[PDB]
């Protein structure tokens, strides 16, 4: 049963904060083919080698895909410290993980283009005490708490957003800021792969 | 949203090797009521306290229920070495675990009684040589590889079962043996509670 990477090739890819994840188990994959459909600019892996994913059988493959400017290629990994790593997307690095940057070809009409690239500059929680900032750093494999108050596409750089937390939650406000980067002629997307050694039933496994 | 322990209170419970797992997420539970409907004969916990589960909140609650004789309560834990721990049911002991032994009251008509109590004396794998035996000890939170060849209720103690594994599986035969303990007047059942700490935590609280 071949792994279904169809959802990626159809639709406007989401922004980094609202990234889309496909979790594959009990399937066989051809990563060379998926990357054939795209123009790859960088493919750097941490606790795995791109070859070993294509030469070895593992329990699960997780592909998180999003629209990301190659202008910020350095910022995606935790090697570089900045807003994306702190408040937008974090892989469970230390586990076998790969980050790829790609430009969508003119041929790939199914992958549509966003109006602009957008990201969260900061997501923070101001407390009722006015003790103020308790910045909400992103958790790996999870979404920023500010995705509720941050628009799918940020209208303007420096846009600021707010939500009032319930008394039960502890009172206070959730505050966020947005930053925008202009869209390229061809969409530049970013792909995150996390492979898990797992125990038995090594199931994702090359073609 | 109350946790639904309803699947347990309706139907003939499975045998230990065929344990039924109910995973509860984003629900609230009162284990006092569930145990209230039964006559508890033991509530022993490791790495957790009966009452801490009732006083604190955890990411998930797993209850595994099965028909088990009180004759074998000593054997159920990893503390005692023997077939149930080796080839039938093993919990993640290092993780918080509770093992509960209870008798179904005459009032609980919905929990029906099996015709006898059954367990796997041995699950072993003869290899391609037709001599080598690799005993298939049960992994935790998983079923025996022999559940396919072992009957849901064993007709006679010492019954033997066989399956030929395909050449792709490494070849060989899968062999198993079964043991029978007579049914009591009132069904005696076994329950396994495993709770998990997590980033959210507030998923399975009490009350």
């Amino acid at each position: 049963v071949e792994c279904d990477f169809s959802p990626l090739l159809s639709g406007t890819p989401p922004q980094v904060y609202n990234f889309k994840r496909l979790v594959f188990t009990n399937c066989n994959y051809n990563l060379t083919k998926l990357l054939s459909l795209f123009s790859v600019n960088d493919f750097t892996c941490s606790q795995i080698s791109p070859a070993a994913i294509a030469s070895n059988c593992y329990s699960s493959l997780i592909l998180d895909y999003f629209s990301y400017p190659l202008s910020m290629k350095s910022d995606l990994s935790v090697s570089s410290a900045g807003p994306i790593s702190q408040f937008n997307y974090k892989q469970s690095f230390s586990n076998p993980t790969c980050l790829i940057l790609a430009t969508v070809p003119h041929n790939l009409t199914t992958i549509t283009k966003p109006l602009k690239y957008s990201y969260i500059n900061k997501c923070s929680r101001l407390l009722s005490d006015d003790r103020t900032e308790v910045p909400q750093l992103v958790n790996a494999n999870q979404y920023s708490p500010c995705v509720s108050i941050v628009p799918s596409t940020v209208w303007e750089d420096g846009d600021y957003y707010r939500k009032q937390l319930s008394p039960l939650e502890g009172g206070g406000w959730l505050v966020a800021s947005g930053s925008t980067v202009a869209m390229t002629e061809q969409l530049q997307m970013g792909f995150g792969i996390t492979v898990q050694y797992g125990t038995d039933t090594n199931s994702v496994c090359p073609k | 949203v109350e946790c639904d322990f309803s699947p347990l209170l309706s139907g003939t419970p499975p045998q230990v090797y065929n344990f039924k797992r109910l995973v509860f997420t984003n629900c609230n539970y009162n284990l006092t009521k569930l145990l209230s409907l039964f006559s508890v004969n033991d509530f022993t916990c490791s790495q957790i306290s009966p009452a801490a589960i009732a006083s604190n909140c955890y990411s998930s609650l797993i209850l595994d229920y099965f028909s088990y004789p009180l004759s074998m309560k000593s054997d159920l834990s990893v503390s005692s070495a023997g077939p149930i721990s080796q080839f039938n049911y093993k919990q993640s002991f290092s993780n918080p675990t509770c093992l509960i032994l209870a008798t179904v009251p005459h009032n609980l008509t919905t929990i029906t009684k099996p015709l006898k109590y059954s367990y796997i004396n041995k699950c072993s794998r003869l290899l391609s040589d037709d001599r080598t035996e690799v005993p298939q000890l049960v992994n935790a939170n998983q079923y025996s590889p022999c559940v396919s060849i072992v009957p849901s209720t064993v007709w006679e103690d010492g019954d033997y079962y066989r399956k030929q594994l395909s050449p792709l599986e490494g070849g060989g035969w899968l062999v198993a043996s079964g043991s029978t303990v007579a049914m009591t007047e009132q069904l005696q059942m076994g329950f396994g509670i495993t709770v998990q700490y997590g980033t959210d935590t507030n998923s399975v609280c009490p009350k």
Partner: nanobody, 131 residues
Framework: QVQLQESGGGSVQTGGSLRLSCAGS????????MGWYRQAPGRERELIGT???????YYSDAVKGRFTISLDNAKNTVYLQMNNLKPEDTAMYIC?????????????????????????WGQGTQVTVSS
């Protein structure tokens, strides 16, 4: 029972470096955010930074190049390294854990509390920097 205790405070001559401690009591594991703040007398509490277990840190942009935050997950202590300390830095340095997605747990007892609805504030330590 759960509390945080700061340490390493005292007197440093200007240009010096001090590393402070915020040990936590009553929790085997913390999945939450531990953060450092400074309050001068007559001045508001100002965020120094926030850290999580992975090593991810946020700096206030004024503590850039001088203040650093570290965490020891076992021995649950968060630390602040302050360098080129100057007289203006003299203030009370306090630490907080809480209000941050993850949970505080004691594996020995089975206790768990959600940091989103809970927070702990440390007593405080004073850094006096003199010429």
């Amino acid at each position: 029972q759960v509390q945080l205790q700061e340490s390493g405070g005292g007197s440093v001559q200007t240009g010096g470096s001090l590393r402070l401690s915020c040990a936590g009591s009553g929790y085997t594991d913390n999945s939450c955010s531990m953060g450092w703040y400074r309050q001068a007398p007559g001045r508001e509490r100002e965020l120094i930074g926030t850290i999580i277990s992975d090593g991810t840190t946020y700096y206030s942009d004024a503590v850039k190049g001088r203040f650093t935050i570290s965490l020891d997950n076992a021995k649950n202590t968060v630390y602040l390294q302050m360098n080129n300390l100057k007289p203006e830095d003299t203030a009370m340095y306090i630490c907080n854990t809480g209000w941050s997605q993850g949970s505080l747990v004691n594996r020995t007892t089975g206790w768990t509390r959600d940091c989103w609805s809970f927070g702990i504030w440390g007593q405080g330590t004073q850094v006096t920097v003199s010429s």
